[PDB]
Design a protein around this ligand. Structure first.
Ligand SMILES: *CC(=O)N1[C@H]2C[C@H]3C[C@@H]1C[C@@H](C2)N3O
Ligand SMILES: [Cl-]
Ligand SMILES: [Cl-]
Ligand SMILES: [Cl-]
Ligand SMILES: [K+]
Ligand SMILES: [K+]
Length: 164
């Protein structure tokens, strides 16, 4: 297991524009295109992202390209964020992946707002952090995925992604 395999499980792979859990146009391995309700706006974003006139379908190679870019961007967003960088630096490898996963799903600003959870993670108070992380819109809207990420923070193992 690694961050790529973890996010591939959590995000799936679809080669045509689809709506994500929040109803937003997405493609590939969880590549958000836009929050606009306009499908044409989403197709314009896709064409710009891929560099060709795509009319909404991409190849697996193109999906994996966006995924590489998106994982790299999540890591770089963590490291440039004054709230997230110290937490990331304090964590072991498995828990670093859990934090990247959250940023991939919700964005840097959203995760950076989990102030009390982030402090508990820095303090290595893993059971307390796990309880606090579940008191969130995130956990209520995507409970199975949030449970997997939270188990990863609680235990520091990949156990929640084994059997998947
Ligand atoms: C991201 C990626 O893997 N790429 C992009 C740049 C080059 C090489 C590959 C496939 C495609 C998109 N190509 O233009
Ligand atoms: Cl629509
Ligand atoms: Cl709550
Ligand atoms: Cl879920
Ligand atoms: K998805
Ligand atoms: K604890």
């Amino acid at each position: 297991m690694n961050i790529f395999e973890m996010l591939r499980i959590d995000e799936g792979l679809r080669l045509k524009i689809y709506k994500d859990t929040e109803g937003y146009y997405t493609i590939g391995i969880g590549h958000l295109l836009t929050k606009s309700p306009s499908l044409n706006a989403a197709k314009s974003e896709l064409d710009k992202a891929i560099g060709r006139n795509t009319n909404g379908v991409i190849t697996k190679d193109e999906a994996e390209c966006l995924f590489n870019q998106d994982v790299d961007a999540a890591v770089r967003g963590i490291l440039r964020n004054a709230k997230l960088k110290p937490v990331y630096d304090s964590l072991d490898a498995v828990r670093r992946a859990a934090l990247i996963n959250m940023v991939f799903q919700m964005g840097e600003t959203g995760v950076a707002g989990f102030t009390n959870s982030l402090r508990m993670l820095q303090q290595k108070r893993w059971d307390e952090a796990a309880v606090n992380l579940a008191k969130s819109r995130w956990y209520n809207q995507t409970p199975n995925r949030a449970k997997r990420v939270i188990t990863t923070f609680r235990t520091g193992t990949w156990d929640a992604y084994k059997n998947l």
